[PDB]
Amino acid sequence: SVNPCCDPVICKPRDGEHCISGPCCNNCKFLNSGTICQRARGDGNHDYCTGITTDCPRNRYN
Template identity: 35%
Template sequence: LTICGNNLVEEGEQCDCGNSESCLQDPCCSSDCVLKPGAQCAFGLCCKNCQFLKTGTVCREEKNECDLPEWCNGTSAECPGDVYKADGIPCSGEGYCYKMECHQRDEQC
């Protein structure tokens, strides 16, 4: 069951700004849960001022040296899933990436 106006984007909705008062103030989403004219998006890490951020805009910084940053693709409001360097990639001198973290040999004994 889809309910427009509950602040949850559900199947068939492009956005959901909540109650009618909130929707009056929302620059991107209308009270019938569709994007306002000219709006590409209403929310998301790759959405700003109702427009998709440019291709190559960083939406998630790397957390550590075994993590990789993620970038907006210019056609979606969503940031791509978090990705990491492959296990076995060298890091911090004599360490190796394993399960998203840099581990030193002496830590493994």
């Protein structure tokens, strides 16, 4: 198949869309900045969506 977010002639997200897949992508758009994408095991340094990428970046306080 082709994923519903993909323009397969360009190999980019279709016109009007942001992203294809990933923990911080939902329905071809980025999740809002600050959305929690993984809760920490010990204590309170969670990982959060950036608003501008589809990955879930590691908390910078570590």
